[PDB]
Amino acid sequence: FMPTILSRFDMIFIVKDEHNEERDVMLAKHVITLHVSIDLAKLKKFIAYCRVKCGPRLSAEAAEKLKNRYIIMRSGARQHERDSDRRSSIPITVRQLEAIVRIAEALSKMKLQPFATEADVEEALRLFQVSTLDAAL
Amino acid sequence: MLPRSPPLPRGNLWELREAQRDYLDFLDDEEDQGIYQSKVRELISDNQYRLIVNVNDLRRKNEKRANRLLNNAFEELVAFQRALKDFVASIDATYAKQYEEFYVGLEGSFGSKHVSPRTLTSCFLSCVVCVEGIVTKCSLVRPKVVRSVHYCPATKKTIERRYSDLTTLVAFPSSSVYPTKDEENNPLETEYGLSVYKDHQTITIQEMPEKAPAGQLPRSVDVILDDDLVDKAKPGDRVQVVGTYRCLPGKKGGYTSGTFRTVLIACNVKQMSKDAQPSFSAEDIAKIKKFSKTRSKDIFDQLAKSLAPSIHGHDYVKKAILCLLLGGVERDLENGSHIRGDINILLIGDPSVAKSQLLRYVLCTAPRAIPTTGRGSSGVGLTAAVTTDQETGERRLEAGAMVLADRGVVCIDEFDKMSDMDRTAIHEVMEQGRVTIAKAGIHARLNARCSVLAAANPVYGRYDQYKTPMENIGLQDSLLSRFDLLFIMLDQMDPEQDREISDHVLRMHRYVSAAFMKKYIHVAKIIKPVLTQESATYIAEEYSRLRSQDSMSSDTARTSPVTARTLETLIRLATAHAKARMSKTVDLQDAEEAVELVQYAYFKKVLE
Amino acid sequence: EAYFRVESGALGPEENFLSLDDILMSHEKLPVRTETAMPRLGAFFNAVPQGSKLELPLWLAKGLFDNKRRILSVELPKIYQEGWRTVFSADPNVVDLHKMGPHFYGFGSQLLHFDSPENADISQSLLQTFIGRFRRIMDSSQNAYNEDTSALVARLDEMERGLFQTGQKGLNDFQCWEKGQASQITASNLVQNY
Amino acid sequence: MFCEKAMELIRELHRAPEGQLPAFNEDGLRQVLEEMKALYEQNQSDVNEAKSGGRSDLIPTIKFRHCSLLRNRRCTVAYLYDRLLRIRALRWEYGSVLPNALRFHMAAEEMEWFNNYKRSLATYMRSLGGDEGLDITQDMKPPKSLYIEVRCLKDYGEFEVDDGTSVLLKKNSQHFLPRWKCEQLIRQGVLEHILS
DNA sequence: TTTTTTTTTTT
């Protein structure tokens, strides 16, 4: 997998398999949940109206939040790649920044909130700190 | 959205004696404002058959006739076209005989008649309708007789014959027997020079895709163009035909099935989409001649700054892309030679430097631009490929991409994921300007005078800033000479630039004139400046200084070889820089604007 | 049956004060061109030039208007322009007066308090559109019984839906008397909660 | 422009055209009184400032603010008045006493308006005739016959007959009573007129 | 509007 087809996305989750015996109790539960054989039927008809009625953009403060988050995300990748340069890595790019913005939009669309704020930018940034460190590992 | 008028109503500002004597009174038109007596004369000065009428006027003039005309279209249009010849004889009887019969189109706003081929039921039989939709085939234009002129070599007389078929407004099936002995005594002989034929086509409108209920195969309808309406529609358009609806019966062997075939005898055609921008206002041309005179120093730079505001940095690249959007001057000598007048740009650099963005903008700005990739494009699918037909089964030459885009732009992104056997198919169509094909049963030469804008990711994934510019690009020194401008969009990790870049993109995510560059370049394209000996001795020197390695520098590598082919790219960039000024004579300030671009695009610096 | 909302006076000289229909009616936007500067308030659109094209609610442009056009002048939307005034004369039974709305006769009768030149030609469009669309509301409302009428009513405005709901309430009330059904005493407003 | 908060009080009552009393909105009402006060002071400042330096060019900025409060007045009396219609109905349809699924949605001062209206109405009613007037609340439909056959639908402690002869009301048990008494209960939801 | 054989362009 090239560092470029990989970079065509924005969020990487290395899914993990748990084989714990309490996890195996969860599995024993799920066994009969199939052996026997907020709802989607309204979730879909909710989305159908949410997507088509909200026009969210960013507020002035989210801008200076993201600028100072992204600049300091860049500012260390230099000393990261200038020494180790292990023939492959993943640095930040403006496409990923635009991905962050369009994620915050979708968060603040859950609430029909026509103006997003710091209410979700940091948690989205931490979600991304997970999603980029996954591909880092 | 409902099209209840051919003129888009939102932004238009920015017995049979009564009918014939009412149409004439309507066509007088003198005493109120003289709207049509200003059009009959207008067409007589252009030698036209038919005139377009607005039924919206017929309403205000006489409602009863306007309603009787939209529901009995045949008996009313045979009386309209009579009381129109009558009214043209009332101006110039000499003209009123040059043409056999006049015609009369229609346009305006019909109430419920604005139908689609899906709604065109059988309650619209013999009723003016206004069908919208896409043309999806055409027929072969063929004559069709409407009168013969015979002659008797024995009796020295001259007999005639009037013809009529089921595709008229009167509909009597005459036989095309071409009488040879009217009376058994004398023999006849036809005279083709004095007879009268007309044209005849048959197209097939089909419902618009985004208007179908998507469950079926969208419905169709058959149109019968005629009498110089003929070639007014090619496959793939969006037309608004305005024609009578008709059913034409038949009988094979004295026994008719009740089933009939219904056609639309068109009497006007309208392309819905406006596909050009020549309709500049006199106020607009005034603005243009102002702006072209205000400052001749800074109009090129001022033009290029406003090119793609959605992008930060890359001033040089915008400058060169503007030069592309203008173009040079194609000189063709007297003996028959030819020298190209286009500029081909190549952009290489690390990912996410807005390359694809520049391409997608140049696509929409210039008219007649074609997009293409580096894997969804074969070496033959770009220029021309041989195939056959399904109806005839004989070979022909389907035009590739770079032949459709003639006098246009071709945007090739990821030009590096294209195999070696595929680039080579371009070396003829990028310089000589025309494609030559000698396949099995095909020997042709197509005109493909176009210009190439290409984007390529460097080898090693990222531009190793230490190797050399020649090892970071895979292209061989034969293809690297065609593209006359090579821009290495190097990405740098200094903390400052990222700050303003983020500022800019985020401002863009919180939302010279844009629609003025269109007119300005569509106007300044035609100008054809001419060199002058003050600069022609400066270029002939900057080149001979470029060609000498010593004068270049040390610790400086060459991106592409300097040949006698960059010499006439200097000349092209120059006479494309004196096209923004609308100058018409290149001066020493031009031949110096276009030398620094080269000095910057040719030589790169290597680090260690 | 006893909740008598305040009706709409949007067709006469001036809208009523407490009518919730006119309140939402006048809120609709309208284009204006300003005649002076707009000091201390250029934040919305600090000062605004003179000769600027702006979009303002109708209620705002009621007091900001004078005969001399002191503060600003007005120009009608295209729905009332000369363009559409011929469309509505071709055949008025075809237009979607809900998209071109949803207050056509209500708005158009308040654009006569701006003493424009073409008033003698707007008050003739309305009259000749309402008369045109009448025999299709008199007959599709007194003759649509136990049907899904949500498609006979998809192209109407608030001045016409109020009549399509009065045709039905008189059809469904004679058809309930003919069938000996309007004798039983029933719960009036509690079946609305149920 | 302005008035985007008041127009969230109205665009809610306009969604309930049946006459069903929604929950009072103290929040938005306070939120619009605040904007009234804000614009009031921020305009009065420049009003008296246009007499203390001659800034008459601010005259527009008065109207744009003078009228832009009248709006916020209209859209807060209409709402406060409309909701006083959907309340009086609950005296001609339900009756003199309401269940607390209703008396829980009225703001605590509308109950005083109610208990005033109800009392004045009961005052007027008893004034018509000599003996305790004529209760015009009942009698909503022309009388058809003299006795009616009802059928209970919920439990109800012990309905009364004028002569002290009570009647228990279990579920699904039908009587034959004079329609002179059953009208109050049929129109609420307790009984039901079966033999139409 | 089907098989089968033979040549040449194309993915």
Ligand SMILES: Nc1ncnc2c1ncn2[C@@H]1O[C@H](COP(=O)(O)OP(=O)(O)O)[C@@H](O)[C@H]1O
């Ligand atoms: N200098 C820049 N100015 C404006 N936008 C930029 C810039 N650099 C990157 N971007 C944004 O980042 C994304 C980069 O994608 P792009 O550069 O098209 O990828 P590629 O370079 O692989 O074609 C685009 O969405 C673009 O809007």
